[PDB]
Design an enzyme around this catalytic site. Structure first.
Site, PDB file in Angstrom:
ATOM      1  N   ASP A 129      22.299 -35.887  21.688  1.00  0.00           N
ATOM      2  CA  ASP A 129      22.762 -36.538  20.374  1.00  0.00           C
ATOM      3  C   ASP A 129      22.478 -37.800  20.226  1.00  0.00           C
ATOM      4  O   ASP A 129      23.230 -38.348  19.720  1.00  0.00           O
ATOM      5  CB  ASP A 129      24.140 -35.925  20.496  1.00  0.00           C
ATOM      6  CG  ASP A 129      24.239 -34.553  20.528  1.00  0.00           C
ATOM      7  OD1 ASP A 129      23.651 -33.620  20.125  1.00  0.00           O
ATOM      8  OD2 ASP A 129      25.077 -34.017  21.621  1.00  0.00           O
ATOM      9  N   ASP A 131      21.725 -39.725  17.637  1.00  0.00           N
ATOM     10  CA  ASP A 131      21.457 -39.887  16.325  1.00  0.00           C
ATOM     11  C   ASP A 131      21.431 -41.343  15.784  1.00  0.00           C
ATOM     12  O   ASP A 131      22.137 -41.922  16.366  1.00  0.00           O
ATOM     13  CB  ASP A 131      22.413 -39.064  15.520  1.00  0.00           C
ATOM     14  CG  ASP A 131      22.535 -37.595  15.754  1.00  0.00           C
ATOM     15  OD1 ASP A 131      21.508 -37.196  15.617  1.00  0.00           O
ATOM     16  OD2 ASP A 131      23.650 -37.031  16.147  1.00  0.00           O
ATOM     17  N   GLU A 166      16.444 -37.762  17.680  1.00  0.00           N
ATOM     18  CA  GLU A 166      17.406 -37.047  17.131  1.00  0.00           C
ATOM     19  C   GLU A 166      17.211 -37.642  15.678  1.00  0.00           C
ATOM     20  O   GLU A 166      16.333 -38.206  15.222  1.00  0.00           O
ATOM     21  CB  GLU A 166      18.599 -37.517  17.767  1.00  0.00           C
ATOM     22  CG  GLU A 166      19.140 -36.190  18.650  1.00  0.00           C
ATOM     23  CD  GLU A 166      19.148 -34.794  17.972  1.00  0.00           C
ATOM     24  OE1 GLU A 166      19.246 -34.692  16.827  1.00  0.00           O
ATOM     25  OE2 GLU A 166      19.216 -33.729  18.678  1.00  0.00           O
ATOM     26  N   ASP A 170      22.617 -37.272   9.894  1.00  0.00           N
ATOM     27  CA  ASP A 170      23.196 -35.832  10.000  1.00  0.00           C
ATOM     28  C   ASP A 170      24.394 -36.160   9.527  1.00  0.00           C
ATOM     29  O   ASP A 170      25.510 -36.976   9.523  1.00  0.00           O
ATOM     30  CB  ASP A 170      23.333 -35.463  11.283  1.00  0.00           C
ATOM     31  CG  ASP A 170      22.084 -34.593  11.780  1.00  0.00           C
ATOM     32  OD1 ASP A 170      20.979 -34.472  11.114  1.00  0.00           O
ATOM     33  OD2 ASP A 170      22.313 -34.103  13.082  1.00  0.00           O
ATOM     34  N   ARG A 218      13.831 -31.250   6.920  1.00  0.00           N
ATOM     35  CA  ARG A 218      15.382 -31.752   6.371  1.00  0.00           C
ATOM     36  C   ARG A 218      15.780 -32.870   5.636  1.00  0.00           C
ATOM     37  O   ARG A 218      16.446 -33.726   6.085  1.00  0.00           O
ATOM     38  CB  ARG A 218      16.130 -31.915   7.893  1.00  0.00           C
ATOM     39  CG  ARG A 218      15.756 -30.726   8.923  1.00  0.00           C
ATOM     40  CD  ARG A 218      16.714 -30.681  10.019  1.00  0.00           C
ATOM     41  NE  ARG A 218      16.572 -29.634  10.945  1.00  0.00           N
ATOM     42  CZ  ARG A 218      17.394 -29.425  11.883  1.00  0.00           C
ATOM     43  NH1 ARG A 218      18.292 -30.126  12.266  1.00  0.00           N
ATOM     44  NH2 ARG A 218      17.142 -28.309  12.709  1.00  0.00           N
TER      45      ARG A 218
END
Length: 352
Positions: A129, A131, A166, A170, A218
């Site tokens: 993770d 990010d 990552e 998000d 995305r």
């Protein structure tokens, strides 16, 4: 002012009684926020004791440059990030021109957070993770004028073959109102989701004046809610752009798309397709696909592509006040306003 040009209405830490501090490293930021939780008597105050404006002057180019030269050695390293958890007094993290970070900002259950002028890239820890920016259960967050980058590449043998690096931004949970604007996102495989799962539907996000270049997918992967994407420059999209899912609604206006595969689609669920209202983009009809090198692909499950380039649903009245520039103007000018070191400059019609 609380106007962000999108759903988020916040001034972050630029409020009355704000305390300004200078951070020269990731650790300084951690310590500054910790101290900001204590009242005059040294007791902790829930949500923070006072508002903050943290100017980050650190520079980690050495880390970034080393990483860029050995892309596949990043995913297995420890992730690095500053966690802004349950801080609601208001906070702004502004990078100084020339500053850089090889660590992310993870916002959790906070409110009124503004992240600006930060150059974050090639973060370690894609398998755990790592990010660049994460907004979780955090409403009224404004991610503006940052440069988020890595390599739009997937190394062999990474867990799940999706963890070389990552996400850039998000958004998940109850981050009810978020504005992502003027960011220069490049070399990122998974830009950012809007809802972490099928049940994580909702939110009202605005993506405006972002310059995407060499990204795989995305932009965002939307699950429900509303997304207003306007005045964004979408170039070199190698996988799919806005993927509107779980009945989400999107208003896609005055953007410029070019060299993009599946720029607007609804795929991977096989059902509950979302809708889009298309208007003012450089692409006005299918004839334009060839002009701007827009290609489409099918999917193994039922999907819907905007290959007819027509609106497939409706969109509520855009609550906020904004004034979009033309798609041509974004194509011409946006690169000089998005990113770090542009003094938080905005693109107006007068500059077109």
């Amino acid at each position: 002012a609380t106007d962000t040009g999108g759903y988020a209405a916040t001034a972050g830490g630029n409020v009355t009684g704000a305390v300004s501090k200078t951070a020269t490293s990731m650790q300084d930021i951690v310590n500054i926020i910790d101290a900001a939780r204590l009242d005059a008597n040294g007791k902790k105050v829930k949500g923070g004791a006072y508002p903050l404006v943290i100017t980050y002057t650190g520079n980690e180019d050495s880390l970034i440059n080393a990483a860029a030269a050995n892309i596949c050695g990043q995913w297995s390293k420890d992730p690095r990030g500053v966690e802004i958890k349950e801080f609601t007094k208001g906070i702004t993290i502004i990078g100084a021109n020339g500053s850089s970070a090889n660590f992310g900002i993870w916002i959790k259950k906070s409110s009124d957070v503004v992240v600006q002028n930060m150059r974050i890239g090639y973060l370690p820890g894609g398998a755990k993770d790592g990010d660049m920016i994460r907004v979780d259960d955090s409403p009224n967050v404004w991610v503006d004028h940052n440069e988020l980058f890595a390599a739009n590449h997937e190394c062999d043998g990474t867990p799940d073959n999706d963890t070389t690096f990552e996400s850039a931004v998000d958004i998940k949970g109850a981050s009810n109102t978020v504005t992502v604007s003027y960011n220069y996102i490049h070399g990122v495989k998974k830009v950012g989701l809007d809802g972490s799962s099928s049940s994580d539907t909702g939110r009202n996000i605005t993506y405006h004046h972002n310059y995407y270049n060499d990204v795989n997918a995305r932009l965002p992967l939307q699950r429900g809610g509303l997304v207003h994407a306007y005045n964004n420059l979408y170039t070199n999209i190698t996988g799919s752009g806005l993927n509107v899912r779980q009945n989400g609604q999107a208003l896609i206006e005055n953007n410029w798309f070019e060299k993009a595969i599946n720029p607007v689609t609804s795929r991977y669920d096989g059902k509950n397709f979302g809708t889009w209202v298309l208007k003012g983009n450089n692409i006005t009809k299918p004839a334009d696909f060839s002009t701007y090198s827009i290609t489409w692909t099918a999917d193994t499950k039922p999907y819907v592509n905007a290959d007819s380039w027509t609106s497939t649903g409706t969109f509520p009245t855009v609550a906020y006040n904004y004034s979009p520039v033309s798609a041509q103007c974004v194509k011409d000018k946006l690169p000089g306003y998005a990113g770090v070191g542009k003094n938080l400059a905005t693109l107006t019609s007068t500059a077109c």
